[PDB]
């Protein structure tokens, strides 16, 4: 497959990653820079993010999903279903609304593309209607993360895909803050892209801190593998 060759050929080894985020949640403004690397052969990504503006006004876990689906390991038997790589190097736009249950919402727009040998994720995030002293603005979410399936389907009208999944963030009191994700991706370029059959990505994420780092930051380790087409 000479197509599942091109976009796909850009991901066969370790790819450097840059992420840049401009954010405004209820007027609380902030910027984040992130760097790391992805190895799609194993579905592995290792990233570190720094709040460059000072204190992050929302919990780091709330931003995990916003901060690289092109790095999913697609089994050989499902390589025709890999939209994210097929859109490279010109890349794709990933838009979301994230509905925090009984709280506000984030709306994000990201461009994911190559700049030279580096895969870049440039994001604008706007959050509105949050509670002051709620789980998000009041920082009540634990610094951890659960494993979740992400469900993918074709959106033939936008020549892209739609994605839907729920994240439950563990709250400090033992309960959970649901974050309902609605997502759309569309290619930036005009070239052919794969429109997949319904399938899912299995995600696991691990959050940590760099013991030498005094800025507000997050270290993220993620494993992601496509499935659900036997």
Curated annotation (Swiss-Prot):
Contains a chromophore consisting of modified amino acid residues. Maturation of the chromophore requires nothing other than molecular oxygen. Changing residue 162 to Q: In R10-3; matures to the red-emitting state with excitation and emission maxima at 555 and 585 nm, respectively. InterPro entries: GFP, GFP-related, Green_fluorescent_prot. SUPFAM superfamilies: GFP-like. Keywords: Chromophore, Luminescence, Photoprotein. Changing residue 145 to A: In Cerulean; leads to improved quantum yield, a higher extinction coefficient and is 2.5-fold brighter than ECFP. Changing residue 224 to R: In Azurite; shifts the excitation and emission spectra to shorter wavelengths and increases quantum yields compared to BFP. It comes from the Eukaryota. Changing residue 103 to E: In mut1.27; shifts fluorescence lifetime from 3.03 to 2.85 ns. Changing residue 148 to D: In Cerulean; leads to improved quantum yield, a higher extinction coefficient and is 2.5-fold brighter than ECFP. Changing residue 145 to H: In mut1.3; shifts fluorescence lifetime from 3.03 to 2.78 ns. In mut1.5; shifts fluorescence lifetime from 3.03 to 2.72 ns. In mut1.27; shifts fluorescence lifetime from 3.03 to 2.85 ns. Green fluorescent protein has been engineered to produce a vast number of variously colored mutants, fusion proteins, and biosensors. Further generation of mutants led to more stable proteins (at 37 degrees Celsius for example) with brighter fluorescence and longer fluorescence lifetimes. Changing residue 150 to I: In Azurite; shifts the excitation and emission spectra to shorter wavelengths and increases quantum yields compared to BFP. Photocytes. It holds the Pfam family GFP. Changing residue 176 to A: In mut2.1; shifts fluorescence lifetime from 3.03 to 2.50 ns. One of its GO terms (biological process) is bioluminescence. Coiled coil: none annotated. Monomer. Belongs to the GFP family. This is Green fluorescent protein.
